[PDB]
Amino acid sequence: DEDIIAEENIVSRSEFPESWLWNVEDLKEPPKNGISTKLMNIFLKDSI
Amino acid sequence: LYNYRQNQELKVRVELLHNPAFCSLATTKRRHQQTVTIPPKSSLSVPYVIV
Amino acid sequence: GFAPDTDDLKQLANGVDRYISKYELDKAFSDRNTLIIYLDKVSHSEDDCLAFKVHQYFNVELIQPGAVKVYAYYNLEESCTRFYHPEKEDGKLNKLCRDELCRCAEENCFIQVTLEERLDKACEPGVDYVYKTRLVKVQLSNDFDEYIMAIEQTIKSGSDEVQVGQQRTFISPIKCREALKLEEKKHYLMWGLSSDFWGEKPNLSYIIGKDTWVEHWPEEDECQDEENQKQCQDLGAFTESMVVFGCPN
Amino acid sequence: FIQTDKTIYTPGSTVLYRIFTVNHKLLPVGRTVMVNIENPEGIPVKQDSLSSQNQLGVLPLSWDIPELVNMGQWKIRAYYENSPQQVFSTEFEVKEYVLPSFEVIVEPTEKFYYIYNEKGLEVTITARFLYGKKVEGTAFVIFGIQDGEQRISLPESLKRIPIEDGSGEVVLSRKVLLDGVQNPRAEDLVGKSLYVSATVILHSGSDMVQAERSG
Amino acid sequence: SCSLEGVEIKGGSFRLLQEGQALEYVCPSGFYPYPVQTRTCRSTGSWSTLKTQDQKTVRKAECRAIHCPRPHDFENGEYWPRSPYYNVSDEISFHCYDGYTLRGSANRTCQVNGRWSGQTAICDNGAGYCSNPGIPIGTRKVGSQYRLEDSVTYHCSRGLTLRGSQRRTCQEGGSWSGTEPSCQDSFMYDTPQEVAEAFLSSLTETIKRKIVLDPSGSMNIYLVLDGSDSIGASNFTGAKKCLVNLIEKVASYGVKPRYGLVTYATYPKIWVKVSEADSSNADWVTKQLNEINYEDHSGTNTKKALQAVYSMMSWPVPPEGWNRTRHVIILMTDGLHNMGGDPITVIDEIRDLLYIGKDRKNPREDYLDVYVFGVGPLVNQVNINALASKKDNEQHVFKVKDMENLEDVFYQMIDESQSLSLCGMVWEHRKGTDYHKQPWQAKISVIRPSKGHESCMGAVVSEYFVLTAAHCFTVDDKEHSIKVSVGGEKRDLEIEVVLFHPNYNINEAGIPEFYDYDVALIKLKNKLKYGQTIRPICLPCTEGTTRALRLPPTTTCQQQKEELLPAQDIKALFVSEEEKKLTRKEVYIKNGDKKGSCERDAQYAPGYDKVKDISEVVTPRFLCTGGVSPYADPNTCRGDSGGPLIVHKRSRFIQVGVISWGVVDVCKNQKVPAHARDFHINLFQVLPWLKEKLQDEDLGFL
């Protein structure tokens, strides 16, 4: 803003895991030519 | 510091927060503040000393 | 704030048995923080080495020490490292202790007076001891310098229990020697916080850090002179006010 | 069938694995199984028994490595309760490390090596960052000779090459290979293999990666 | 002599305390001043510098929104969603990996107080001698060994101060040693309900609740107050009532204690030492307490007072029963800014006498309890924390807002033990429900002919009568339009009669609306059994109301009107219904000289085109509440009208009126105009009709 950006109001990346998403999922969508589709959402980590 | 902009020059400020468990040149009253310039599509290195 | 000289680096690379990367040549002097050299071989009988100049292009206070590291390509865990600094011996940072644990002393020596200032900030909820002492002896050494003092009366006692006639030890860094300007057989009044205690029961010691305040006190015969007569009655009233009334907090 | 999430661990971490059970026709079944964990020497450290009824045939488990533990190769051995004659096994490693930042690939132009070529053997070096951008640095390459449980290093074949945009070329000639061994007759070399080792360093002196191709 | 000009705070007000030597800011609910709340004037005439957590000076006084803390770490799990900061009334859901088990709460939300609602979520495997401690929200944990004789350490982020144990050790049985830390900030206070609940739960044990003693056992209570220059209120006024209430409550359990009273400003002063043979009865100690005076001409020396207590308990061979006695020490310190020595070593030596921590097979841990109460905005949390005791499943440090809250807490404690007879009490436990928080509201649903649904609210005045707004209910409504919902159940109940105000009417003047006397009552023939989730409400100018205001019975109804409705902006609340749940909303009522100003904008209401006299339909009994005076506060709803109006004071809820209508329709845009004002019926004016119709139930109406 009116003040040049100093180092007081910035958050820092912290999460650095090595393996995640150890979940289990089930398919029960009504069939369509024998192919069931499920939609899931995931939140990415803080690594590059 | 990694810069990956095709046509740009950056002048950035770098700070290292202090910690009672370490000893460095940064005390409670005064803290490290460095000003550096990064060439485009490049990297820069800054060293720090710790006890 | 330090940089190598391009001409000397070029001359060194032009020599044999040493190799400098082609990329580092198009690295105009402004950005030359780190340098890397490849050595073909090192003798195991004599010392073969080099040297080069360093220029300064920027003025910065409290300059950090440098670093030099050397190792072999296949084995990385076996390496040698060294430090250096112009005004500091062996590049090691300043710290004072005895073989187990310690803080460091990269700080100042003192803070820097009117009557009301002394009245008010001697009642902070942080300060612990307020004494007046007579300096009995001084001893200089290598790691720090020590003073032995005698206590006349406990104006405001703290956690440590002392009685009149005991002796106390004060530790200080060398850089404060010119700052304090202490001499034999003189009276001072002093107060400090509680974080400065060092050692343990019973060989407690005090540290003259930034927050501790020490002031000279004239001899009793010269409070009739206006040099510090005002301060003489000011501190007398301050002492009797703490002894009789205390402090309004 | 046994699945583990990772391949190499550090002390103080945790190990998570799964077991799948199938019959001859490769369909889910439910029976009783037993699982043992074996240290490098061979003496079991922890054993357990489980049943996989009413789960469609997936068993998740867990273990927690201590802080003061040995190093090397550890084994997991599982078998059915009915027939202890047949066992199934899996391996993993325990060794402290720090995660790298880029990958190195070494490859020749021809898998074989005809002994009558005058160009020797040529290999190429390709290094790349993890997120897709290219890399620069310097590489050291060395060769070797592999016989049945035996390795011989040729000290004369050690080269330094600058890697720019992730591309380096190394060439080995007949003379060095012939002089490295005491066999003037070329036809005696048939039946012995070669391998190459490379090391890549950056221009900032920050990382160190090693890659090896054998056989 | 300090510069008192230019100390205005944006969005709030400020007050001067202790005759120009202190200044204190204030902003409405949902905001907090930055970065300090109270400033003091030093001797030099210079205003004190702004002391933050890290001395962050600002050039203007403003108050900002309340931010709930952001989670730091979570091991073996995942939570949704993520944001840099969480506003008020936001939700977080936890869910963790396969092959583990989750204990605690899965959905957590943070309310206006500043704390997340529920417990801590812990995902565990089940392969250790002693169980997972878990990460409290906001902290960070070091240590990952869960076998015998290991330790775990906690610490949290910047700008936060810890409250609890620093290191925890896995004991022999399988339980940890200490309490679960949860670090707080400056602006979170504790309300009287939780303080009373925690104090009672820690002091006694359950079976009702009775105190447990070994045979030939005894208790020794030591109360330590301070008289330094922090309040200067007459001669220890206010504390006397709290001490008397505590003595009575303790003696009510049929136990024989021995008391001791000390007072310290710079030197200790004993009043009733335990060694006296007359210090074992309540009357004598109360008489001795009722003669405390003042002697100051300042300072603070906690070490000397604690050493005096030590000398009091010291024995000069020990007598019989020293192995079967209990010691309780209550410290009412608002300061603890020590000047003359730290007080930790005294506690260490005191517990060294009793042979507590000097064994491994006989810990003997529960034979010494220390409670600390803190008052005001100058409390130093870190010093308070290190002095009290620390045990699991209990809380031993309390911090309140002001001096009134102490007597509030003790009055609530002394009133909790009463039967279900009294009016308007609320007692919420840790696992309560929505209806437990509001045990009085009832709902009536009607299908009016030639119209859709009609939902209205009401309060349970007594076991026979139900009060509801007369707009909802008309004379032509039959039993098909009479459905009651009380006790938290959908079950209906048969009625006896309905009563309307004789002067209630709705009828060429250009104003087809006439809300005069919007009072309706339903009279039953059924007795209700008072329980947990259902409770009545308490009405003004009644013997019970006088007994529920901590006043002598000489107060008149006019004096009660003045006290409950002074000529000032007065806090009040209405329990609105949102998202199929009930939640309270705060409002400010203006019965002062600004009542005319609040009513000066009544012409903006629709259908008020031909208002000849502004008060011809806006009767003087109307009360104008809500609006933008002085802050933009949401008003009530036309489609949700019917509910009662409740004022909250002395930890008690008192009926004041029934909602009538609002100026404009803006509530239906839920998915606030300045001129939007709420008009309500004052119940003081309708007193004669209720008095003439309430002479049978005998509820002490006077």
Ligand SMILES: *[C@@H]1O[C@H](CO)[C@@H](O)[C@H](O)[C@H]1NC(C)=O
């Ligand atoms: C307390 O008295 C003595 C210690 O002097 C001890 O023998 C006795 O058993 C103790 N009483 C208990 C533990 O109830």
Ligand SMILES: [Mg+2]
């Ligand atoms: Mg005080």
